[PDB]
Design a protein around this nucleic acid. Structure first.
Ligand SMILES: [Zn+2]
Length: 362
DNA sequence: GCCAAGGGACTCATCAATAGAA
RNA sequence: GGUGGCUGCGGGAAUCUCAGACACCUUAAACGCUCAUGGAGGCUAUAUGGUCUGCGAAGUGAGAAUCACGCGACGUCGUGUGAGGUUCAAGAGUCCCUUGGC
DNA sequence: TTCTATTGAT
């Protein structure tokens, strides 16, 4: 019943806290690079990889050294977790060395990039959560907007810089999540359509989860923005402004899609005991990920149809397969075996529901 | 050699000691 | 007078308040804006068609777009601090890889 | 000066 859960809140640090955040990110990156180089040199020297303990000790001697004493300014937890990041990169590489086929590459030097994070643990109430405030080590109280009810025991806080002037902190808390009570409906079947994002059916009726309002309208504004950027010559300030506006429109599209999927998946979890989706505008990967983790948290069970199931071809009533349904132009078709005409999307959702129950076994 | 966006695999600290301060 | 929406802030989405503007006349559709410069093109639908434009299109440079309070400068501007309604929803981190663009 | 916040070693 106790789950690792993350609460993302937007940070609004003042000038000094922003300076300290940037210093901490730089220090973490420098430590990662330096001790990657040190491990490589050690393997070249003695043929034995340095343990995390040996890398930790040299960091402590690095901190006291005059040439690298500046690391004392930033939080210790950030540097040590950067060292743990290096160790995990090495661990991934070592695990994949034996395996054939897909192989994790050797760790590479960390480079300056817009999205960087530093992670600080919790100990002796150094992290405290108030109403509209958040306390982080070495920083003090920082004002947070959109702070939900944060419960459980705080484990660590990940301070992330999405882009310049945009900071988000992901507070990891070990919160107990109570199971949702019995759902009004038993099971659902979910599809993919062109005009409609999905066709959710409980068996009594079909509910068309159409695309969110203004989604097609926003896609129009996406096309307009690209035209202006394309004709604009590169390197101009107005070209930069057009690129920023295009980036903002992309961000709005992503946010609207995520909100639509979050509300839809929460509704599916609350409304149906068992949810069944075929595994494959779509954004299907995030939909499946959210459905699976929310079902695990709230006690629902997700049954994913085997991709070998050709639901669209089969008729729900009789199971006859028709090659005509393979053609997309055939939105409405009649099954000669069952002598019935049914909508393609409606027939697909009912079949996906039927297979979802079979896989769960009920 | 340089940036952005997706995807798959694995995972999500604790405590004794100690310096300092309102 | 009534109706709709483009752009900006209000954690995300819708609504709404306000603001930059504006369209039309009971139908809701379309479009962010200002200044300077620029010198015939710009947008949409199905190679074809429609609309804007030369008392100025694309492109380039600059700027403003909620509220309260303090400070400085010349009623005005610059700066910092603080605040922003109602309803629904919010699981992230690390590593490598892939793709796209330079 | 006892409570608060940070550090090094696992
Ligand atoms: Zn049939």
């Amino acid at each position: 019943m106790i789950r690792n859960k993350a609460f993302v809140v937007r940070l609004y640090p003042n000038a000094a806290q922003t300076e300290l955040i940037n210093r901490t990110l730089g220090s973490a990156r420098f430590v990662y690079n330096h001790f990657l180089a040190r491990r490589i040199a050690a393997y070249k020297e003695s043929g034995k990889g340095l343990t995390y303990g040996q890398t930790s000790s040299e960091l402590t001697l690095l901190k006291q050294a005059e040439e690298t004493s500046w690391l004392s300014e930033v939080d210790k937890f950030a540097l040590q977790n950067s060292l743990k990041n290096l160790e995990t990169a090495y661990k991934n590489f070592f695990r994949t060395v034996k395996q054939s086929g897909k192989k994790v590459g050797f760790p590479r030097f960390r480079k300056k990039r817009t999205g960087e994070s530093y992670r600080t643990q919790f100990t002796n109430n150094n992290i405290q959560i108030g109403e509209g405030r958040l306390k982080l080590p070495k920083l003090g109280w920082v004002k947070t907007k959109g702070q939900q009810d944060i419960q459980g025991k705080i484990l660590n806080v990940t301070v992330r810089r999405i882009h310049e002037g945009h900071y988000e902190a992901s507070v990891l808390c070990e919160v107990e999540i109570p199971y949702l009570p019995a759902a009004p409906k038993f099971a659902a079947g979910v599809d993919v359509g062109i005009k409609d994002f999905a066709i959710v059916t409980d068996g009594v009726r079909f509910k068309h989860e159409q695309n969110p309002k203004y989604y097609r309208s926003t896609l129009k504004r996406l096309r307009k923005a690209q035209q202006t950027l394309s004709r604009r010559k590169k390197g101009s300030a107005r070209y930069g402004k057009a690129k920023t506006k295009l980036a903002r429109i992309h961000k709005r599209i992503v946010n609207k899609r995520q909100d639509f999927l979050h509300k839809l998946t929460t509704s599916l979890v609350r409304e149906y005991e068992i949810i069944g989706t075929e595994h494959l505008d779509a954004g299907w990967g995030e939909f499946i990920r959210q459905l699976e983790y929310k079902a695990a948290w709230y006690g629902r069970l997700v049954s994913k149809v085997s991709p070998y199931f050709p639901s669209s071809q089969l008729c729900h009533d009789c199971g006859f397969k028709n090659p005509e349904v393979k053609n997309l132009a055939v939105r409405t078709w009649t099954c000669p075996n069952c002598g019935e005409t049914h909508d393609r999307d409606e027939n697909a959702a009912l079949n996906i529901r039927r297979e979802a129950l079979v896989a769960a076994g009920i």
